[model samples]
Target: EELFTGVVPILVELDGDVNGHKFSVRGEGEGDATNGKLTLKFICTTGKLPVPWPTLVTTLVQCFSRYPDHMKRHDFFKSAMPEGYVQERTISFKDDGTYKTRAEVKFEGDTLVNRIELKGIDFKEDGNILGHKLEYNFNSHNVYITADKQKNGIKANFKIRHNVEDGSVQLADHYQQNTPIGDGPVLLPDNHYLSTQSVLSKDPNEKRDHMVLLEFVTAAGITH
Candidate 1:
């Protein structure tokens, strides 16, 4: 339950047994902070399973948005990339190897950009393993490592994307009306206040990137 102000909803699917569930969020000009301006009340809805709000948040952030792992990238930046041991940054892995938190970001700068700090990269064989003995899989024609001189304990790594602002970074927060966001068919509101989607692609053979459109109908239905 929250007010969706500047944030846009690309998809809104209530997980669990939500086929026969009734979802309604009543609101006017002013938004709701609890049930939200639009509420997904599954009380009358018939579902085979229950939809926990926390779980809902988990599933949607990556798959629903335009950028893959954009929501996570935001949090990682906020956390300043902690240690490489655990994922305290909110991930429901439910596994053992899910223990290691890998933070890799292709940072974009206007002119001069360097240095990306990675966290959660603690290995048990830090002192035991040798460079030649262990398999260093960074062999790539495009894999360019920066020789900025970092220590062995410092687990940060990055590759520079010079002058590449294809909208991978959302730090500016600058947008216009009716601009579509997402790589594939993104769910947006229609002019009739109905849920719909728009498809964008770079080519027919390949998937799309960097597009955002707010369905007029869907946007109209949900009050700010």
Candidate 2:
């Protein structure tokens, strides 16, 4: 669901390359968090890039770990609250005609907060099937998130204000679950604080170009 969990009827298009590598991608994907899975199908219309096997495999792992952003109830761990919890999985694929990769992650506590670019999330207890939508304003780095309150017959609203330096959040105190699950400082899963996209970038920032690698393959399960 990483590909489409937070993105409704998600379809993303890309024509850029990773640093010196070149390729174009088209993906279609969707998610259903209540049932606990999401998937994507992608086709790359270009030749291979100059990258290694392990580097490519790492990309697939993050794609799977990208959780649905709009869900209210996340099964961080089936039981107990959290001293903290984290799960990471990385996988890769290669066939006669295509190459694919995936990454998946689950985290609770501040562990969920610092890693994902999410501002806030709202859902009732066990409210995983509710609807979610994100409205972007290119005029500024602001995102509006909306989730359905089907059970309570209400709505949950939150806004994220983004800027180069820091971000702010306007959270509505009406939900069973919210991101940054615990009241502690942000924490991230071990060794996952940065991009796993391209290990061959000439500059560090270009390394994040691997993001596109994620978008094409994240909704890994739905490919079935």
Candidate 3:
């Protein structure tokens, strides 16, 4: 009935450059075999130079899933600059389910830079367990950006769903940008992995980049 059982372990790694600073993250988590939960924590140590020596970026991720059917993920991210500037964000979503989602980011303390909320998503499905038809009923999506911070930060909201029709997976109801732009869906065919390059710069003309890679696989064996 279930493809994987007992304790399943997942590994996570992040490597990239942010605002001209280099950083990397690595961690692991273990969860139940089926219909279980997993949590992973990572602290990315930034590169030296730029007069700060070392800056810390911390992230906490929690995932709840039912085998290969559906998954819900929540991510908490925080980054503290050397000059008393702090950024925090919370992103959550339900994949192939209700699509209940919330994403928000704040700077310094209470300054809201960006926010988006989706309520009561109407999901349409047709087909069986392995392959099916999927669609959404909502169209309007929102993105907020303050004038003070408009050149560096990036925000995105979407749900990862399995597209059995085309033999692939995709990100439905997707939106990503800094100032303002349109949003759409993305199809990932012939591959089970995704990689992203992100930028978080405070300066208007400086280049700071970061890379994040994600994949899902099963372990060969367990120790205990």
- Please name the candidate that would achieve the greatest TM-score relative to the true structure: 3
Predicted candidate 3 versus true structure: per-residue lDDT over 41-91, tens digit per residue? 333334322111111111212112222322111111111111111223332
Q: Of 2 and 3, which scores higher on lDDT?
A: 3
- Per-candidate Cα lDDT values, in order, are 0.19, 0.25, 0.27
Give the runs in model 1 whose Cα sits over 4 Å from its true position: 1-11, 15-44, 48-53, 58-91, 96-224
Clash totals in order? 26, 15, 3
- List, residue by residue over 1-224, the lDDT tens digit for candidate 2: 22223433334343433333455544444433333333444344454433321222222212223333332132222211232223221111111111222112233322221121111112222221111111111111111122222321112122212111123321212121223223443322111111111212122453222322222211121111
Error of 2 at 185 (Å): 19
User: Which parts of model 3 have CA positions greater than 4 angstroms off?
Assistant: 1-3, 45-64, 67-224
Model 1 Cα displacement at 188 (Å)? 19
lDDT of 1 by residue, 18-110 (tens): 223323211111112111122121121232222222111111111111212222222111122111111112222211101111212111221
